[PDB]
Amino acid sequence: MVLYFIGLGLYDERDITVKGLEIAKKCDYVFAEFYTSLMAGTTLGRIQKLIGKEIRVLSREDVELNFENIVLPLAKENDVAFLTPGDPLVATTHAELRIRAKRAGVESYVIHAPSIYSAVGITGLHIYKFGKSATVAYPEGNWFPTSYYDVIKENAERGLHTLLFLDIKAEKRMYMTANEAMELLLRVEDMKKGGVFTDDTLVVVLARAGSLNPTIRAGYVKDLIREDFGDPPHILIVPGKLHIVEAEYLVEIAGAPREILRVNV
């Protein structure tokens, strides 16, 4: 008699909230997708073990095309759950699935979970200072995406930071790295030459948020473009004008160039 959208969190199976676990343990059927993001700290088995239910995984197509044929039909006579990495409604199009649920006469509920969108708080950058966000997508064929480049520009002009979700092709097991994302951004700089992303632009990389030992680094592109930030997933951030306290955290915690301390007011 219900459908639950339950978030699994940032890194491993324990990133689920107690609410989400207690509820998932009591559902009759459990579905999940693992294409919107990457949980590099667990495995399907451990999750199934933690929840104590068989977890039927779905592909982007099963979801996007047959959600109402695969999941909804059961939600009518049973308690069904749909799991996702991080928060189920952040940087996905899952929200519209609630509309399908409604249109099918199924009540739906949402259980949140830690999201990279808020997790960036660990970088020491003020969350309220983040502007519009964007995704650095893989180029395909002769199509060259540049929108994400303009987002950075627009925010930087207001002194705001930019959060850059990195692309992903789960079926191919391809998880864009920050290094890759930086390369792509430099290329776009050649094209537009708007002085947005150069070798002297300060950036911050967060890898494996949620793990006890995430990788947090801040520095100039020229020096990080070649750095190894560990296994994915990675997120890239282009800070705006920094508050002194932010710079302090970047230098003290993310080992950034001690020079960023002398901010330009």
Ligand X SMILES: Nc1ncnc2c1ncn2[C@@H]1O[C@H](CSCC[C@H](N)C(=O)O)[C@@H](O)[C@H]1O
Residues forming the site for ligand X (CB under 6 A): 10-11, 36-37, 85-87, 90-92, 115-117, 165-166, 168, 206-210, 233-235
- The answer to whether the beta carbons of residues 218 and 250 sit under 8 Å apart is yes
Binding site for a copy of itself (CB under 8 A): 7, 9-10, 12-19, 21-22, 50, 86-96, 98-99, 102, 109-110, 112-115, 117-119, 121-122, 124, 126-135, 154, 158, 160, 165, 209-210, 212-213, 245-246, 248-249, 252-253
Q: How far is CA 1 from CA 62, 111, 127, 134, 217, in A?
A: 22, 17, 38, 37, 47
Surface-to-core class of residue 44, CB atoms within 10 Å of its CB (0-12 exposed, 13-18 middle, 19+ buried): middle
Nearer to ligand X, 81 or 168 (CB): 168
- On whether 234 is known to bind a ligand per the annotation, the reply is yes
- On whether 209 is known to bind a ligand per the annotation, the reply is yes
Tell me the closest approach of the beta carbon of residue 138 to ligand X, in angstroms. 11
The set of residues, in sequence order, having a beta carbon less than 8 Å from that of 54 and lying 6+ positions away, is 30, 48
Nearer to a copy of itself, 160 or 203 (CB): 160
Nearer to ligand X, 41 or 131 (CB): 41
Nearer to a copy of itself, 178 or 216 (CB): 216
User: To the nearest 10°, the Cα dihedral for 58, 143, 178, 250?
Assistant: -120
59 binds, among ligand X, a copy of itself, none (CB under 5 to 8 A by kind): none
The set of residues, in sequence order, having a beta carbon less than 8 Å from that of 18 and lying 6+ positions away, is none
- On whether 166 is known to bind a ligand per the annotation, the reply is yes
Q: How far is 173 from 227, CA to CA, in rounded Å?
A: 21
Tell me the closest approach of the beta carbon of residue 60 to a copy of itself, in angstroms. 17
